[PDB]
Amino acid sequence: MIWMFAAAAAQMIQGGLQYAQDAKNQRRQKADQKYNEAVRSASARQITEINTQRSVEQNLQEVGVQLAAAEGNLMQNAELTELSLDSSVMNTVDQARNSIREGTDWAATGSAVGQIGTSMVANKL
Amino acid sequence: MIWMFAAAAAQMIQGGLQYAQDAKNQRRQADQKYNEAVRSASARQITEINTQRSSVEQNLQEVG
Amino acid sequence: NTVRGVQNTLTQNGSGTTQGNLNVPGAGFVSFNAGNSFGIQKNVVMGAVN
Amino acid sequence: IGGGVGALSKVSRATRLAVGLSATITPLDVVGTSVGIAMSAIPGIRKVAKAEQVQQGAVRGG
C-alpha cells in the first residue's frame, strides 16, 4: 500500500536536499578555516583539565569483593593439588594426615547426617 | 553433532557485526585532522604521568 | 561389504554406547546398562527407571 | 581405437621402457611377457551365503 510509506518518504526528502546543498558550498570557496580547527585543541586542553584531574548496598559490594578474592585464592591453591600425583611434598602430606587420624563406606556416612537432617540444632538445645 | 557448536556460533556472531560498524564509522568521516591532535597531545601527558609514577626467607636469598 | 560389517560391529549399528549409572539409596552409585531390543533411545529408557 | 588423451606418447614411452628393462632377456620378450602377466589372474565369483556364518566372521573383526 502506497499510503503506508508517506511518513518515511517525507523524512527521506530532507536528506537529499542538504546532500546537494553541502556540495555546492565547497565549490564556492580555505586556509583560514584550517587554523580555527587547530585552535579548537585548546578546548580539548580546557576539557583536559577536568579529564586530567580524573545499609544493604555496602554489604553487597563487600560480598562481591570478598567473593572475587576467595575465587582467586582457591584458583591459586589448586595448582599444587594438580601435581600431587608426582610432587614429593604430597607424600609427606597425606601421610601426616593419615598418621593424625587413627574400609570406610562413604554412602553410609552420608545417610547418618541426612536422617538427622534439619533438626540438628533442635536436638542439641 | 550440530548442537555442540551452538555456544561457539553465538559468540562468533558478535565478531561480524563489529567488523561492519568500523567500516561505516571510518567512511562517515576532514575531521581526522582534529581527531589526530587529541591523541598527539594526550600521549605526552600520559607519558609524563607514567614518568612521575615511576627467619628462612632471608637466609635463602643470602644463600642464593 | 566386509569392511562395512566390521564398522557396524565397531559402532554398534550406529546407535552408540549404552552404559549408564544408577542412584541406589544407601548403596550409592552402581553400573547400569540401558540396552533394549525395541529401539527406545537411552534417555527415554532411563526415564521410567528413575 | 580412439578418443584417448594421446596415443603416440604412450607407445613411444612403452618402447623405451621395454628397451631399458632388458639391460625375458631381449626387447621382444619383454613386450611378449608384459601381456602374459596382467591377464593370468583367476577371477572371483559371487555366491549366496548363510547369514550366520558371515555374522560370525564379521564379529571376529572389531
mmCIF file of C-alpha atoms in Angstrom:
data_model
loop_
_atom_site.group_PDB
_atom_site.id
_atom_site.type_symbol
_atom_site.label_atom_id
_atom_site.label_comp_id
_atom_site.label_asym_id
_atom_site.label_seq_id
_atom_site.Cartn_x
_atom_site.Cartn_y
_atom_site.Cartn_z
ATOM 1 C CA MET A 1 0.000 0.000 0.000
ATOM 2 C CA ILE A 2 1.411 3.348 -1.099
ATOM 3 C CA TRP A 3 -0.046 5.285 1.831
ATOM 4 C CA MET A 4 1.941 3.379 4.476
ATOM 5 C CA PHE A 5 5.258 4.914 3.364
ATOM 6 C CA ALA A 6 4.179 8.573 3.367
ATOM 7 C CA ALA A 7 5.994 9.441 6.602
ATOM 8 C CA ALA A 8 9.151 7.597 5.543
ATOM 9 C CA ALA A 9 9.181 9.418 2.205
ATOM 10 C CA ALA A 10 8.627 12.782 3.894
ATOM 11 C CA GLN A 11 11.556 12.144 6.231
ATOM 12 C CA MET A 12 13.747 10.967 3.338
ATOM 13 C CA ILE A 13 13.117 14.130 1.298
ATOM 14 C CA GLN A 14 15.180 16.208 3.726
ATOM 15 C CA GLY A 15 18.274 14.034 3.341
ATOM 16 C CA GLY A 16 18.571 14.563 -0.399
ATOM 17 C CA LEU A 17 18.321 18.353 -0.328
ATOM 18 C CA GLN A 18 21.114 19.034 2.160
ATOM 19 C CA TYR A 19 23.311 16.403 0.497
ATOM 20 C CA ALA A 20 23.285 18.514 -2.669
ATOM 21 C CA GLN A 21 23.400 21.837 -0.819
ATOM 22 C CA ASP A 22 26.505 20.925 1.189
ATOM 23 C CA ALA A 23 28.385 20.096 -2.016
ATOM 24 C CA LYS A 24 27.537 23.492 -3.512
ATOM 25 C CA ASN A 25 29.097 25.277 -0.532
ATOM 26 C CA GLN A 26 32.532 23.734 -1.061
ATOM 27 C CA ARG A 27 32.698 24.693 -4.748
ATOM 28 C CA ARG A 28 32.178 28.344 -3.719
ATOM 29 C CA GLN A 29 35.400 28.511 -1.681
ATOM 30 C CA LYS A 30 40.143 27.955 2.732
ATOM 31 C CA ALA A 31 43.380 28.207 4.704
ATOM 32 C CA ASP A 32 41.783 30.415 7.365
ATOM 33 C CA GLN A 33 39.300 27.636 8.156
ATOM 34 C CA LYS A 34 42.083 25.163 8.957
ATOM 35 C CA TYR A 35 43.601 27.484 11.566
ATOM 36 C CA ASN A 36 40.387 27.620 13.603
ATOM 37 C CA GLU A 37 40.276 23.830 13.951
ATOM 38 C CA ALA A 38 43.808 23.799 15.372
ATOM 39 C CA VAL A 39 42.791 26.417 17.944
ATOM 40 C CA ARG A 40 39.945 24.064 18.881
ATOM 41 C CA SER A 41 42.606 21.894 20.532
ATOM 42 C CA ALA A 42 42.572 24.491 23.319
ATOM 43 C CA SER A 43 39.029 23.405 24.177
ATOM 44 C CA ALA A 44 40.272 19.817 24.402
ATOM 45 C CA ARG A 45 43.031 21.086 26.689
ATOM 46 C CA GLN A 46 40.438 23.013 28.704
ATOM 47 C CA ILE A 47 38.287 19.884 28.875
ATOM 48 C CA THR A 48 41.556 18.076 29.636
ATOM 49 C CA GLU A 49 41.813 19.929 32.957
ATOM 50 C CA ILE A 50 38.837 18.043 34.392
ATOM 51 C CA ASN A 51 39.907 14.952 32.437
ATOM 52 C CA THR A 52 43.486 15.214 33.717
ATOM 53 C CA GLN A 53 42.188 15.581 37.276
ATOM 54 C CA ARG A 54 40.384 12.267 36.740
ATOM 55 C CA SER A 55 22.564 -0.410 54.746
ATOM 56 C CA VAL A 56 22.416 -3.286 52.263
ATOM 57 C CA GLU A 57 24.274 -1.966 49.214
ATOM 58 C CA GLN A 58 27.546 -1.591 51.121
ATOM 59 C CA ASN A 59 27.290 -5.194 52.301
ATOM 60 C CA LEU A 60 26.583 -6.350 48.747
ATOM 61 C CA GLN A 61 29.677 -4.600 47.369
ATOM 62 C CA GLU A 62 31.809 -6.047 50.164
ATOM 63 C CA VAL A 63 30.399 -9.511 49.451
ATOM 64 C CA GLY A 64 31.300 -9.184 45.783
ATOM 65 C CA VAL A 65 34.862 -8.111 46.551
ATOM 66 C CA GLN A 66 35.497 -10.900 49.054
ATOM 67 C CA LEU A 67 33.934 -13.474 46.723
ATOM 68 C CA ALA A 68 36.325 -12.463 43.949
ATOM 69 C CA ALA A 69 39.250 -12.658 46.374
ATOM 70 C CA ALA A 70 38.243 -16.135 47.567
ATOM 71 C CA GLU A 71 37.889 -17.376 43.993
ATOM 72 C CA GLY A 72 41.383 -16.102 43.251
ATOM 73 C CA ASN A 73 42.837 -17.753 46.351
ATOM 74 C CA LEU A 74 41.286 -21.136 45.561
ATOM 75 C CA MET A 75 42.427 -20.952 41.938
ATOM 76 C CA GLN A 76 45.982 -20.185 43.042
ATOM 77 C CA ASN A 77 45.958 -23.014 45.605
ATOM 78 C CA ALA A 78 44.650 -25.719 43.249
ATOM 79 C CA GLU A 79 47.963 -25.732 41.349
ATOM 80 C CA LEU A 80 49.787 -27.974 43.846
ATOM 81 C CA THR A 81 46.920 -30.437 44.209
ATOM 82 C CA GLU A 82 47.060 -30.683 40.414
ATOM 83 C CA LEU A 83 50.651 -32.023 40.590
ATOM 84 C CA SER A 84 50.034 -34.042 43.775
ATOM 85 C CA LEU A 85 50.376 -37.233 41.694
ATOM 86 C CA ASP A 86 54.130 -36.673 41.227
ATOM 87 C CA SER A 87 55.138 -33.955 43.728
ATOM 88 C CA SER A 88 57.239 -35.314 46.592
ATOM 89 C CA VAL A 89 55.755 -32.951 49.198
ATOM 90 C CA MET A 90 52.312 -34.522 48.816
ATOM 91 C CA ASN A 91 53.785 -37.812 50.029
ATOM 92 C CA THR A 92 54.772 -36.258 53.370
ATOM 93 C CA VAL A 93 51.362 -34.635 53.358
ATOM 94 C CA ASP A 94 48.593 -37.253 53.123
ATOM 95 C CA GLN A 95 50.921 -39.328 55.283
ATOM 96 C CA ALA A 96 50.834 -36.869 58.168
ATOM 97 C CA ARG A 97 47.054 -36.670 57.747
ATOM 98 C CA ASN A 98 46.665 -40.450 57.978
ATOM 99 C CA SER A 99 49.027 -40.670 60.951
ATOM 100 C CA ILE A 100 46.953 -37.973 62.686
ATOM 101 C CA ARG A 101 43.649 -39.793 62.014
ATOM 102 C CA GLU A 102 43.981 -43.044 63.967
ATOM 103 C CA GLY A 103 37.008 -49.914 54.536
ATOM 104 C CA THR A 104 35.039 -46.711 55.087
ATOM 105 C CA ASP A 105 31.694 -46.711 53.266
ATOM 106 C CA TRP A 106 31.060 -43.116 52.218
ATOM 107 C CA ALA A 107 27.426 -43.836 51.343
ATOM 108 C CA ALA A 108 26.798 -44.985 54.916
ATOM 109 C CA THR A 109 28.306 -41.778 56.308
ATOM 110 C CA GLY A 110 26.014 -39.502 54.306
ATOM 111 C CA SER A 111 22.812 -41.249 55.367
ATOM 112 C CA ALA A 112 23.571 -40.675 59.051
ATOM 113 C CA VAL A 113 23.708 -36.900 58.576
ATOM 114 C CA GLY A 114 20.744 -36.953 56.205
ATOM 115 C CA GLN A 115 18.455 -38.727 58.660
ATOM 116 C CA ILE A 116 19.093 -36.071 61.310
ATOM 117 C CA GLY A 117 18.503 -33.516 58.575
ATOM 118 C CA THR A 118 17.243 -30.087 59.581
ATOM 119 C CA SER A 119 16.572 -30.786 63.287
ATOM 120 C CA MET A 120 20.271 -30.690 64.210
ATOM 121 C CA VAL A 121 20.213 -27.589 66.417
ATOM 122 C CA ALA A 122 16.814 -28.537 67.843
ATOM 123 C CA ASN A 123 18.054 -31.946 69.024
ATOM 124 C CA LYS A 124 21.032 -30.380 70.861
ATOM 125 C CA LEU A 125 19.488 -27.366 72.607
ATOM 126 C CA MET B 1 26.785 -33.272 16.320
ATOM 127 C CA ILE B 2 25.261 -29.938 15.327
ATOM 128 C CA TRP B 3 24.093 -28.809 18.777
ATOM 129 C CA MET B 4 27.513 -28.726 20.477
ATOM 130 C CA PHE B 5 28.700 -25.759 18.374
ATOM 131 C CA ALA B 6 25.797 -23.502 19.387
ATOM 132 C CA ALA B 7 27.772 -21.586 22.017
ATOM 133 C CA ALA B 8 30.696 -21.027 19.648
ATOM 134 C CA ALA B 9 28.367 -19.837 16.888
ATOM 135 C CA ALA B 10 26.550 -17.471 19.245
ATOM 136 C CA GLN B 11 29.833 -15.988 20.450
ATOM 137 C CA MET B 12 31.123 -15.657 16.873
ATOM 138 C CA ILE B 13 28.032 -13.767 15.669
ATOM 139 C CA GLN B 14 29.181 -10.664 17.549
ATOM 140 C CA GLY B 15 32.511 -10.542 15.711
ATOM 141 C CA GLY B 16 30.992 -9.985 12.283
ATOM 142 C CA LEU B 17 28.685 -7.153 13.331
ATOM 143 C CA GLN B 18 31.501 -5.086 14.846
ATOM 144 C CA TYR B 19 33.654 -5.563 11.746
ATOM 145 C CA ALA B 20 30.929 -3.906 9.661
ATOM 146 C CA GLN B 21 30.404 -0.975 12.041
ATOM 147 C CA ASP B 22 34.034 0.168 11.835
ATOM 148 C CA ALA B 23 33.812 0.489 8.051
ATOM 149 C CA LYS B 24 30.817 2.820 8.333
ATOM 150 C CA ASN B 25 32.407 4.786 11.171
ATOM 151 C CA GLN B 26 35.538 5.442 9.109
ATOM 152 C CA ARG B 27 33.578 6.139 5.910
ATOM 153 C CA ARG B 28 31.351 8.790 7.522
ATOM 154 C CA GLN B 29 34.450 10.953 8.090
ATOM 155 C CA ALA B 30 38.217 16.022 7.151
ATOM 156 C CA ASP B 31 37.680 15.635 10.897
ATOM 157 C CA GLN B 32 40.740 13.361 11.048
ATOM 158 C CA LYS B 33 42.881 16.486 11.450
ATOM 159 C CA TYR B 34 41.071 17.410 14.665
ATOM 160 C CA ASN B 35 40.970 13.775 15.794
ATOM 161 C CA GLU B 36 44.732 13.257 15.499
ATOM 162 C CA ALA B 37 45.658 16.233 17.690
ATOM 163 C CA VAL B 38 43.722 14.825 20.650
ATOM 164 C CA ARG B 39 45.850 11.672 20.743
ATOM 165 C CA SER B 40 49.023 13.590 19.879
ATOM 166 C CA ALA B 41 48.502 15.735 22.980
ATOM 167 C CA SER B 42 47.188 13.015 25.303
ATOM 168 C CA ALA B 43 50.220 10.810 24.633
ATOM 169 C CA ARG B 44 52.626 13.373 26.097
ATOM 170 C CA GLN B 45 50.509 13.867 29.223
ATOM 171 C CA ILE B 46 50.155 10.107 29.728
ATOM 172 C CA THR B 47 53.913 9.649 29.348
ATOM 173 C CA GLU B 48 54.558 12.439 31.856
ATOM 174 C CA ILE B 49 52.139 10.885 34.356
ATOM 175 C CA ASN B 50 53.791 7.482 33.944
ATOM 176 C CA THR B 51 57.238 9.027 34.424
ATOM 177 C CA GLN B 52 56.044 10.747 37.599
ATOM 178 C CA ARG B 53 54.609 7.464 38.889
ATOM 179 C CA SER B 54 57.950 5.815 38.066
ATOM 180 C CA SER B 55 63.768 -16.353 59.553
ATOM 181 C CA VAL B 56 64.171 -18.508 56.428
ATOM 182 C CA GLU B 57 63.057 -16.230 53.580
ATOM 183 C CA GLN B 58 66.186 -14.090 54.059
ATOM 184 C CA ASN B 59 68.758 -16.835 54.585
ATOM 185 C CA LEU B 60 67.566 -18.399 51.329
ATOM 186 C CA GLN B 61 68.280 -15.218 49.352
ATOM 187 C CA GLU B 62 71.667 -14.852 51.030
ATOM 188 C CA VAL B 63 72.466 -18.463 50.125
ATOM 189 C CA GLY B 64 71.499 -17.890 46.501
ATOM 190 C CA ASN C 1 30.795 -55.467 2.439
ATOM 191 C CA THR C 2 33.201 -56.967 4.984
ATOM 192 C CA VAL C 3 34.609 -53.527 5.826
ATOM 193 C CA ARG C 4 31.098 -52.182 6.399
ATOM 194 C CA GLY C 5 30.229 -55.214 8.521
ATOM 195 C CA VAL C 6 33.277 -54.637 10.720
ATOM 196 C CA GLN C 7 32.434 -50.939 11.039
ATOM 197 C CA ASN C 8 28.849 -51.756 12.038
ATOM 198 C CA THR C 9 30.062 -54.086 14.791
ATOM 199 C CA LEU C 10 32.505 -51.425 15.987
ATOM 200 C CA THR C 11 29.873 -48.664 16.135
ATOM 201 C CA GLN C 12 27.027 -50.997 17.222
ATOM 202 C CA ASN C 13 24.820 -50.282 14.200
ATOM 203 C CA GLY C 14 25.300 -46.562 14.807
ATOM 204 C CA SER C 15 23.158 -46.483 17.956
ATOM 205 C CA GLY C 16 26.114 -45.589 20.188
ATOM 206 C CA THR C 17 27.088 -46.794 23.632
ATOM 207 C CA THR C 18 24.515 -47.634 26.304
ATOM 208 C CA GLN C 19 26.492 -47.706 29.567
ATOM 209 C CA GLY C 20 24.862 -45.910 32.465
ATOM 210 C CA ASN C 21 24.611 -45.470 36.217
ATOM 211 C CA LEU C 22 22.011 -45.611 38.986
ATOM 212 C CA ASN C 23 21.486 -43.981 42.371
ATOM 213 C CA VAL C 24 20.561 -46.612 44.970
ATOM 214 C CA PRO C 25 19.776 -45.347 48.499
ATOM 215 C CA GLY C 26 22.496 -46.351 50.932
ATOM 216 C CA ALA C 27 24.460 -48.418 48.423
ATOM 217 C CA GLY C 28 25.455 -45.402 46.323
ATOM 218 C CA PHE C 29 26.264 -45.450 42.623
ATOM 219 C CA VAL C 30 26.129 -48.677 40.609
ATOM 220 C CA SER C 31 26.517 -49.615 36.957
ATOM 221 C CA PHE C 32 23.501 -49.989 34.681
ATOM 222 C CA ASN C 33 23.041 -50.892 31.010
ATOM 223 C CA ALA C 34 20.139 -49.295 29.132
ATOM 224 C CA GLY C 35 20.252 -51.542 26.062
ATOM 225 C CA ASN C 36 16.949 -52.919 24.805
ATOM 226 C CA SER C 37 15.554 -54.854 21.850
ATOM 227 C CA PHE C 38 12.817 -52.368 20.862
ATOM 228 C CA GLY C 39 14.876 -49.319 19.878
ATOM 229 C CA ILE C 40 13.976 -46.944 22.716
ATOM 230 C CA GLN C 41 16.585 -44.201 22.967
ATOM 231 C CA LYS C 42 18.740 -44.115 26.090
ATOM 232 C CA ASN C 43 17.337 -41.036 27.826
ATOM 233 C CA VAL C 44 13.788 -42.328 27.300
ATOM 234 C CA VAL C 45 14.563 -45.734 28.814
ATOM 235 C CA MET C 46 16.214 -44.048 31.798
ATOM 236 C CA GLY C 47 13.028 -42.036 32.418
ATOM 237 C CA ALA C 48 10.824 -44.817 33.782
ATOM 238 C CA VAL C 49 13.503 -46.440 35.948
ATOM 239 C CA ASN C 50 14.096 -43.133 37.756
ATOM 240 C CA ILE D 1 40.753 -47.364 -31.197
ATOM 241 C CA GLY D 2 40.459 -43.662 -30.424
ATOM 242 C CA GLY D 3 39.341 -40.943 -28.017
ATOM 243 C CA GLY D 4 42.167 -41.217 -25.505
ATOM 244 C CA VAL D 5 44.440 -38.419 -24.349
ATOM 245 C CA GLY D 6 47.472 -39.106 -26.518
ATOM 246 C CA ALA D 7 48.336 -42.396 -28.199
ATOM 247 C CA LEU D 8 51.779 -41.867 -29.734
ATOM 248 C CA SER D 9 53.261 -40.665 -26.443
ATOM 249 C CA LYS D 10 52.263 -43.832 -24.580
ATOM 250 C CA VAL D 11 53.616 -46.142 -27.295
ATOM 251 C CA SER D 12 56.891 -44.227 -27.612
ATOM 252 C CA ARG D 13 57.284 -44.490 -23.826
ATOM 253 C CA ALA D 14 56.442 -48.191 -23.664
ATOM 254 C CA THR D 15 59.064 -48.980 -26.300
ATOM 255 C CA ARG D 16 61.735 -47.113 -24.327
ATOM 256 C CA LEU D 17 60.751 -48.860 -21.092
ATOM 257 C CA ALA D 18 60.887 -52.241 -22.823
ATOM 258 C CA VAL D 19 64.356 -51.490 -24.192
ATOM 259 C CA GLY D 20 65.589 -50.274 -20.813
ATOM 260 C CA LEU D 21 64.449 -53.228 -18.715
ATOM 261 C CA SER D 22 66.277 -55.700 -20.965
ATOM 262 C CA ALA D 23 69.614 -54.115 -19.992
ATOM 263 C CA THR D 24 62.558 -62.008 -20.874
ATOM 264 C CA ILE D 25 66.144 -61.283 -21.938
ATOM 265 C CA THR D 26 65.515 -59.409 -25.211
ATOM 266 C CA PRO D 27 63.249 -56.446 -26.030
ATOM 267 C CA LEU D 28 60.725 -58.626 -27.879
ATOM 268 C CA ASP D 29 60.371 -60.961 -24.902
ATOM 269 C CA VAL D 30 59.663 -58.079 -22.532
ATOM 270 C CA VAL D 31 56.771 -56.996 -24.769
ATOM 271 C CA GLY D 32 55.543 -60.574 -25.023
ATOM 272 C CA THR D 33 55.637 -61.306 -21.293
ATOM 273 C CA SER D 34 54.129 -57.990 -20.186
ATOM 274 C CA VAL D 35 50.765 -59.188 -21.547
ATOM 275 C CA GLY D 36 51.086 -62.806 -20.419
ATOM 276 C CA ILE D 37 51.073 -61.370 -16.922
ATOM 277 C CA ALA D 38 48.204 -58.979 -16.148
ATOM 278 C CA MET D 39 45.846 -61.497 -17.753
ATOM 279 C CA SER D 40 46.506 -64.735 -15.846
ATOM 280 C CA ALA D 41 44.790 -63.688 -12.595
ATOM 281 C CA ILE D 42 41.950 -66.131 -11.887
ATOM 282 C CA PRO D 43 38.782 -64.095 -11.206
ATOM 283 C CA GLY D 44 36.462 -64.438 -8.230
ATOM 284 C CA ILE D 45 32.723 -65.085 -8.482
ATOM 285 C CA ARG D 46 29.906 -64.063 -6.158
ATOM 286 C CA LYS D 47 27.868 -66.702 -4.338
ATOM 287 C CA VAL D 48 24.980 -66.752 -1.888
ATOM 288 C CA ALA D 49 25.932 -67.160 1.767
ATOM 289 C CA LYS D 50 24.321 -68.288 5.004
ATOM 290 C CA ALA D 51 23.700 -65.287 7.246
ATOM 291 C CA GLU D 52 25.015 -66.863 10.449
ATOM 292 C CA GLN D 53 28.477 -67.675 9.087
ATOM 293 C CA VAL D 54 29.032 -64.148 7.768
ATOM 294 C CA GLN D 55 27.988 -62.526 11.051
ATOM 295 C CA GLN D 56 30.378 -64.799 12.950
ATOM 296 C CA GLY D 57 33.227 -63.762 10.667
ATOM 297 C CA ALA D 58 32.435 -60.064 10.963
ATOM 298 C CA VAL D 59 32.247 -60.292 14.768
ATOM 299 C CA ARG D 60 35.828 -61.603 14.852
ATOM 300 C CA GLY D 61 36.632 -58.235 13.345
ATOM 301 C CA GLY D 62 36.194 -55.214 15.549
#
